[PDB]
Design an enzyme around this catalytic site. Structure first.
Site, PDB file in Angstrom:
ATOM      1  N   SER A  12      33.908  23.839 -61.704  1.00  0.00           N
ATOM      2  CA  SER A  12      33.872  22.598 -60.909  1.00  0.00           C
ATOM      3  C   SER A  12      35.144  22.472 -60.122  1.00  0.00           C
ATOM      4  O   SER A  12      35.163  22.184 -59.005  1.00  0.00           O
ATOM      5  CB  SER A  12      33.568  21.419 -61.523  1.00  0.00           C
ATOM      6  OG  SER A  12      32.850  21.909 -62.669  1.00  0.00           O
TER       7      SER A  12
ATOM      8  N   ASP B  69      28.539  20.972 -56.598  1.00  0.00           N
ATOM      9  CA  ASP B  69      29.929  22.232 -56.381  1.00  0.00           C
ATOM     10  C   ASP B  69      29.039  23.431 -57.037  1.00  0.00           C
ATOM     11  O   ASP B  69      29.703  24.363 -56.405  1.00  0.00           O
ATOM     12  CB  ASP B  69      30.762  21.421 -57.573  1.00  0.00           C
ATOM     13  CG  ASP B  69      30.371  21.203 -58.938  1.00  0.00           C
ATOM     14  OD1 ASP B  69      29.009  21.164 -59.335  1.00  0.00           O
ATOM     15  OD2 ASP B  69      31.282  21.003 -59.670  1.00  0.00           O
TER      16      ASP B  69
HETATM   17 ZN   LIG Z   1      30.929  21.499 -61.671  1.00  0.00          ZN
HETATM   18 ZN   LIG Z   2      30.613  22.258 -65.717  1.00  0.00          ZN
END
Ligand SMILES: [Zn+2]
Ligand SMILES: [Zn+2]
Ligand SMILES: [Zn+2]
Ligand SMILES: [Zn+2]
Ligand SMILES: [Zn+2]
Ligand SMILES: [Zn+2]
Ligand SMILES: [Zn+2]
Lengths: 444, 446
Positions: free
Chosen positions: B95, B362
């Protein structure tokens, strides 16, 4: 071009954009009609399959000169229906989904060219043929399989390839029972100008009834004025394909051999086995034409029609190798399809009135995962063009076949009416998008 | 404006989401004019599979997200990270590396936050918007020190460097007492966004080892630097200003804010051996905990007061957490939670006229929609959807207690000025440049 700018480690080096796209996208939008349509289907080619194949063959910052070169993009939904309830079935089979874009009607898993009431509906190929347009149906798999068949046959079970299986599983569609016939019998009736693929073994079967009873479907075709080609040299020798001399190309008994050879994914394969490098398939003869080679000849013959043409191209073995949990075969077939998409765009850009669409019938099992991953399914480490390891995983089935997934997936398009694939749409919207683009009317 | 099924999904054309030709409407959606504001909404781990699973469950297959699916300009973007030692791609990003890519326009390694593979810090879109005199907002449903809200306000070599304790030990180079800029929280307080709302209150209990507010808790540091501290929905509501003189900091949980929906965890042969599940409201989520849409709405209201414009980032972070936990209900609930926030953003943008709203993720995640009859090797669960049909969700990429991210390219959608820049295939780093150009921002690092 949408490849990485330069040094992916530097700021801006990984950018795929060179400037603002507003002006270029404005110019990509045309309300004008399409003279021709080239629809390219990657069977089971979900966004995961596109990424896995780009990462492998072109590098992560790479670019498919075909698949990724279509400016207008969106995501579309491909759920089927439950035949008894009429409610959605979130994971479609290849046939129900092929029926959705070719007729604009959703159907049940098993159906081919018929809705949940088993009522047949005209296909985009049939309507194009009705309006005087040339028609092309090209696939790397058996011509009786879901994707090419949905354009030319109406059966209650996609397994009704020839007269033998039809009489037994589709008694309502069996020729000797008053029906339209098997997929192959209906295919020969449909008389597309250009039909190229596999599935030669069903043409060995003989008709139980009708005008060509007791003769092989291969013999029926010959008697009906078709041109039969079985290799790349003879396909090349064809100069015309029309309603008088239609072209039938049978390049394999079943599915045409896959282009790349690699081992099957295994339990802890990324851990217990070395990183794999795909190799050209040695069993594949050079005389077997490629999808791009078949696409190119179809384009050539069909564009002789002054009123226009409709061509569908199916990279069907993407799905087959995803089922087989074979990353190399799967990536190879995505690369095979990219070459065909390139031919279609090369043509479209030059012609100016051709709408090229690239999508999939449904998503599939394969997933790109971290190299260190300890997954319960089948995995494989692959050595990509970047000189880095990619791990692919298949973890949705304990049976010998990996299964389709219901995730919405990419639909991309270039040319007239291409704006209709942007945003969220349905697989059935594709039928209407095509119908409108060619200015076709309902006919059967 | 609406992309729901026309009528009878069983009838010809009944499943169509289009009412006519889209050429004219897409032509009108295309604007070369500049964005006064940007609202970036991130569904952590919200791949195309997560969007579909949620829509199928909450709205029906022929349904439509009034937020998530209402953005006219769409594309697919790539989010691979880099291997720190080789500089070669790492096909599955975490992330923090992915949040750094869209917030700075530089790729990085899994672990990095606001720094490149050389550990060199780069200005973020939030920092440049602040430099040009725009209002800045950072909202999340998870810890403010976690990847997505942290990538906008901190530069650390390890995303685990939440407070001074973890920083001194894991990021000695960034530790305040070692000449560094500080922990994520110390850097967050320095960054001084006008509106910061989320979780991660527990790290604000830690005291600074060095610097101007040494020996005082990070919570006390915030108070001493003129911040407004809110901890529930009633107090959030009571806020009227939020500027550089009186910035606002909202801490609504010790860690991650509780998820809205409760359902059991997916299990081995769960779709076969366990009954179909129907999601229920989470009894552990108090009504005093603000929702993502509630935080988004107050942020938009306060940042709007800035005449020059504003940049707001909204993170539906618990989508990822529940995907990792193989909990379809929590995961779908948080996608629904994010859809409500996307709706607030569009409602605002349509009225204002110069606001660019972007909705993406993401990275992709583990969950997959599979056939009801499926015998999978991983974790599965059958769910009873709005359609009155069963949906089976599968998690088959990890034998460990956490399901993993996937590297598949995913949907990026946008509305407003410069939204054409998300169409086709792009990179997560292109998003940074798209946002920079739209706001007409210049490179700056205070
Ligand atoms: Zn993520
Ligand atoms: Zn994750
Ligand atoms: Zn298929
Ligand atoms: Zn027909
Ligand atoms: Zn299949
Ligand atoms: Zn900074
Ligand atoms: Zn309000």
């Amino acid at each position: 071009n949408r490849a990485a700018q330069g040094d992916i480690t530097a700021p801006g080096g990984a950018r795929r954009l060179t400037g603002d796209q507003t002006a270029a996208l404005r110019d990509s939008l045309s309300d004008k009609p399409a003279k021709n349509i080239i629809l390219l289907i990657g069977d089971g080619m979900g966004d995961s399959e596109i990424t896995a194949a780009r990462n492998y063959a072109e590098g992560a910052g790479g670019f498919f000169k075909g698949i990724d070169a279509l400016p207008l993009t969106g995501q579309y939904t491909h759920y089927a229906l439950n035949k008894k309830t009429g409610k959605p079935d979130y994971v479609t089979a290849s046939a129900a989904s092929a029926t959705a874009w070719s007729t604009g009607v959703k159907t049940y898993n098993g159906a081919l060219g018929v809705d949940i009431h088993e009522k047949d509906h005209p296909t985009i190929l049939e309507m194009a043929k009705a309006a005087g347009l040339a028609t092309g149906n090209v696939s790397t798999a058996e011509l009786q399989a879901a994707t090419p068949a949905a354009l030319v046959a109406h059966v209650t079970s996609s397994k009704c390839y020839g007269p033998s299986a039809t009489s037994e599983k589709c008694p309502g569609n069996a020729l000797e029972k008053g029906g339209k016939g098997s997929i192959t019998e209906q295919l020969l009736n449909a008389r597309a100008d250009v039909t190229l693929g596999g599935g030669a073994k069903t043409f060995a079967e003989t008709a139980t009834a009708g005008e060509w009873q007791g003769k092989t479907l291969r013999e029926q075709a010959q008697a009906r004025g078709y041109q039969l080609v079985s290799d790349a040299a003879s396909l090349n020798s064809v100069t015309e394909a029309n309603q008088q001399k239609p072209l039938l190309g049978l390049f394999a008994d079943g599915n045409m051999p896959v282009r790349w050879l690699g081992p099957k994914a295994t339990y802890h394969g990324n851990i217990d086995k070395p990183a794999v490098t795909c190799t050209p398939n040695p069993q594949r003869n050079d005389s077997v034409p490629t999808l791009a080679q078949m696409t190119d000849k179809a384009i050539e013959l069909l564009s002789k029609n002054e009123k226009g043409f409709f061509l569908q191209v199916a990279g069907a073995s993407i799905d087959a190798q995803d089922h087989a949990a074979n990353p190399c075969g799967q990536i190879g077939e995505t690369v095979d399809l990219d070459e065909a998409v390139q031919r279609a765009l090369e043509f479209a850009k030059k012609e100016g009135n051709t709408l090229v669409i690239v999508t999939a019938d449904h998503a599939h099992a394969s997933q790109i995962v971290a190299p260190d991953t300890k997954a319960p399914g089948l995995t494989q480490a692959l050595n990509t063009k970047d000189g880095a390891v990619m791990v692919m995983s298949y973890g949705n089935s304990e049976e010998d076949s990996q299964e389709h997934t219901g995730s919405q997936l990419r639909i991309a398009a270039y040319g007239p009416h291409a704006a209709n694939v942007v945003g969220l749409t349905d697989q059935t919207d594709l039928f209407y998008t095509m119908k409108a683009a060619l200015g076709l009317k309902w006919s059967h």
